[PDB]
Amino acid sequence: KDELLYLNKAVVFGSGAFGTALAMVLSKKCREVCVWHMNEEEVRLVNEKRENVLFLKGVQLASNITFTSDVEKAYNGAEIILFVIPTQFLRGFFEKSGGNLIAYAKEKQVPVLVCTKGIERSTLKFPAEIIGEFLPSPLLSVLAGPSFAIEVATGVFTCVSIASADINVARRLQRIMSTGDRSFVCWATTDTVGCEVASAVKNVLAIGSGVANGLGMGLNARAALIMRGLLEIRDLTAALGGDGSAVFGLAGLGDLQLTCSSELSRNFTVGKKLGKGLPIEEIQRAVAEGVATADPLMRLAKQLKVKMPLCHQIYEIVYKKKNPRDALADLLSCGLQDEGLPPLFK
Amino acid sequence: KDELLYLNKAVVFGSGAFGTALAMVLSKKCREVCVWHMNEEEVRLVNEKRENVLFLKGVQLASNITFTSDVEKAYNGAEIILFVIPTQFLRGFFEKSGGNLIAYAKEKQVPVLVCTKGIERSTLKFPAEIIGEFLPSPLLSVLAGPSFAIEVATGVFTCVSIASADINVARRLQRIMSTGDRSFVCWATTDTVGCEVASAVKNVLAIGSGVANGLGMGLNARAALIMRGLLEIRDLTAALGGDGSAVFGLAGLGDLQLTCSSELSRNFTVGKKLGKGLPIEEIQRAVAEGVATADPLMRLAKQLKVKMPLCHQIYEIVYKKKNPRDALADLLSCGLQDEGLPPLFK
Ligand SMILES: CCCCCCCCCCCCCCCC(=O)O
Ligand SMILES: CCCCCCCCCCCCCCCC(=O)O
Ligand SMILES: Oc1nc(Br)nc2nc[nH]c12
Ligand SMILES: Oc1nc(Br)nc2nc[nH]c12
What we know:
Two copies of one chain form a homodimer.
Chain A: E1 7-13, H1 17-26, E2 30-36, H2 40-49, E3 65-68, H3 71-75, E4 81-83, H4 87-108, E5 112-114, H5 127-134, E6 140-144, H6 149-153, E7 158-163, H7 167-177, E8 184-189, H8 192-214, H9 219-239, H10 250-260, H11 266-276, H12 280-283, H13 289-304, H14 309-319, H15 324-331
Parallel strand pairs in A: 1-2, 1-4, 2-3, 4-5, 5-6, 7-8
Antiparallel strand pairs in A: 6-7
The complex binds palmitic acid (2 copies) and 2-bromo-6-hydroxy-purine (BOA) (2 copies).
Residues 38, 85, 89, 92-93 of chain B line the site of one 2-bromo-6-hydroxy-purine.
Enzyme class (chains A, B): oxidoreductase
EC number (chains A, B): 1.1.1.8
Catalytic activity (chains A, B): sn-glycerol 3-phosphate + NAD(+) = dihydroxyacetone phosphate + NADH + H(+)
């Protein structure tokens, strides 16, 4: 259906640049929107300054956005729930504070939208999969696509995709997240897995992009990194059970191309230093997503016997003091190959 | 085979930034390399200055590169032929000067490499297809991929793909074009058509990229343009008979992502002005590829009944004084949709 849905309330768990930006979209589709941040003092500050001076500096919170540190106040009444809490704290949030939240969600069949990205080290599971150990899969959807937070927060044209096992769940979320001025447009897909794989691997690939640049390479190089890197997202996706339809779409190619040209992103800058030769120890001074993700990503790949050439060489560069140039050459040690893509049309 | 081939001679027909840059690659794989430019006086100049001051300013021609205006001197001995002559003059070159060249190519089974890009207005045929009316298809290959000329000319890491009906022809060209230092790496594919479609349509899409920017949009937008734009390349490719395997590869996604972020490209700048509202008449002051290509591209699409939403709206903006904002809204008039990509894995 091409007709939008407006609600009375929405809560967002995660007070980062991304969740905050997402609350601005919701603020235009929901009467009320709470954003859950844990530090009570910060909650008040932000509410006073009418601005998340914490993670999205320079943006003016809609007046109907209210930060709260009380989980219970956050979800009560909410007709949509967004999770954007970082991977590492996800499970612990659910164990230590999700009790009432879970029961509420189950009782009222409240749609849940996963926006957290990564791989959990202990289990090597993805964010929606974790959340799925606490909440029935049918209530769950995943949001992914090229979406720089500032741009999303200030209403500049953005297209993301929403994925759910049941397309019909995605289509209903598509109608709650899409704005009235067509500035935030959601496309439906069923590929939850491809979405989550693309989201996680893009951050690792994005350090490679930095590596390339620090190494003296240019735009031809980066384009080739995005293209080959995508095959790695596609193969890991196949192995994990996904149907792969998100791979060449917004969640995959779209978010991947974006994240890799983000020259001022911390993923890029870190790779760029490693590229220039600076040791990782010297660098770290606010961790980069790709750095944290490379390790688990590598363990998961190994466990599933998926070859991910770019992601391994990026992992070695980051974790095992491998010379970027030695890495590049090894990557190119393969010899002359076929492009390796299947025909679309027989 | 992962082992390279070096030759005694190579000729390149086309004295642009691209062919000139390609001659620098060849100059490292061929004893001798002639580059055919028509103006005899210019030929001498360039040869004296040891630099194509004409279209690739600031680059030092290998010493084994010699410009010549004598077709006959150009190909005699050549063991590979590259065409990079612009589309519009392609046929006329073959009719007015290819006589001896054609016979020579046929007689010695000289591999031909098509690097020209576009759609010929009269026939709506692509460059390799044209050349195929004068030369047996088996001798023909197509080169495509993300490859900014300066970067290719100065040896900065570049990956392109080479396509031929027979993969084995592509693999042999792959071994002649790939350099000894792995700075120019060629991947083989059979998708000649997808390659040529991607090459032509990317220039039109690249004006859209400019439109987006002139309209105030940012990087999220551009990423979404690249992703949806690609479907248009895929659908036109299906209709023309291609197997589509080049689409999500170097020739497609790769070259597309590159060409659309080329903020200083004439395709971008033109779109950007149209975006800012400047009338096309006011703009033109050296035509942009996408401008010339939009018309034929639109006629070809129509003739084949392929819907190419972005390319049509770009055509209207360029040829029919359509307001970019009116265009954007119409493009978004579709309503809430599914992403529309097939599963890769069943
Ligand atoms: C950690 C290594 C990153 C180095 C950055 C490389 C710059 C872009 C390289 C892209 C070339 C792709 C190589 C693919 C080779 C293969 O498939 O085995
Ligand atoms: C000539 C029009 C160009 C306007 C530039 C638009 C900026 C990026 C827009 C990408 C959104 C893709 C819209 C697809 C809608 C559809 O499939 O019908
Ligand atoms: O322990 C923690 N839980 C959550 Br939820 N978020 C955090 N941020 C820092 N420490 C944290
Ligand atoms: O007529 C022409 N033929 C070729 Br080949 N190239 C050209 N460039 C300008 N006019 C030309």
